[PDB]
Amino acid sequence: GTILIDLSPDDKEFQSVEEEMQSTVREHRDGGHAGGIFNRYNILKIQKVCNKKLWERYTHRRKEVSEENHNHANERMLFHGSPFVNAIIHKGFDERHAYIGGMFGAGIYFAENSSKSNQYVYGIGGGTGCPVHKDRSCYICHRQLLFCRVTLGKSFLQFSAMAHSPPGHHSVTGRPSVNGLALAEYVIYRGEQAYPEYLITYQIMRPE
Numbered sequence: 001g002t003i004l005i006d007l008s009p010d011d012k013e014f015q016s017v018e019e020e021m022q023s024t025v026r027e028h029r030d031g032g033h034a035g036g037i038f039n040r041y042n043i044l045k046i047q048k049v050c051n052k053k054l055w056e057r058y059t060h061r062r063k064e065v066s067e068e069n070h071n072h073a074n075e076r077m078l079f080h081g082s083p084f085v086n087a088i089i090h091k092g093f094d095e096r097h098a099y100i101g102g103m104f105g106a107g108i109y110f111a112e113n114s115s116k117s118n119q120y121v122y123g124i125g126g127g128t129g130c131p132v133h134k135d136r137s138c139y140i141c142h143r144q145l146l147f148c149r150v151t152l153g154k155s156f157l158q159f160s161a162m163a164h165s166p167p168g169h170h171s172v173t174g175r176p177s178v179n180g181l182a183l184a185e186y187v188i189y190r191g192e193q194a195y196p197e198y199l200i201t202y203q204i205m206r207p208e
């Protein structure tokens with residue numbers, strides 16, 4: 001029962017979501033290997049993802065976390081890129097989407113930097129790039145990211161040199177320690193702690 005509603009570029013909701021995507025682009029230490037070389041995106045569309053069942057599943061978990069955490073869900077809006085984006089908007093996040101080899105544990109990963117999530121749209125490491133051209137820096141093919149509502153609850157703070165959550169925690173916060181430009185990443189262990197609120201379709205832009 002998911003329906004996608006197109007936002008008009010003239011709508012303030014479109015404009016705030018586009019500004020979060022654009023303003024959280026950073027340079028990556030791979031020189032663009034995984035996600036391509038760019039400083040900004042061309043946003044083609046932003047759709048609101050509406051699924052009553054998935055939304056209730058998310059608010060039900062959010063109330064349980066918030067009750068375990070002095071009435072504080074610690075809810076954030078974060079990006080998630082994956083080849084499974086079509087399945088996530090219809091069926092929700094789940095364990096099948098956990099990153100088994102993730103540095104901060106086997107869970108589902110979200111990013112503050114949209115350009116970190118862009119690195120994963122075509123798979124771990126950028127996979128083989130776009131399906132059409134096999135190009136991880138393709139400027140033609142349309143990519144998609146989710147901008148998601150995520151319940152962190154009590155988050156374990158892991159400093160990083162760039163399964164279940166640690167006992168008594170509802171998530172993990174991956175704090176960069178070496179690149180003072182990198183924003184945080186977060187990992188959750190139950191799919192019902194994230195709701196894919198917006199589906200953003202875009203291209204990366206070749207720098208001038």
Ligand SMILES: Cc1cc(=O)[nH]c2cc(-c3ccc(C(=O)O)cc3Cl)ccc12
Binds near residue numbers: 080109
């Ligand atoms: C760090 C991070 C940020 C993000 O926005 N998205 C991701 C997605 C995956 C991921 C996990 C499993 C698989 C697969 O089973 O094939 C694929 C991917 Cl892309 C892993 C990590 C991230």
Ligand SMILES: [Zn+2]
Binds near residue numbers: 132140
């Ligand atoms: Zn392509």
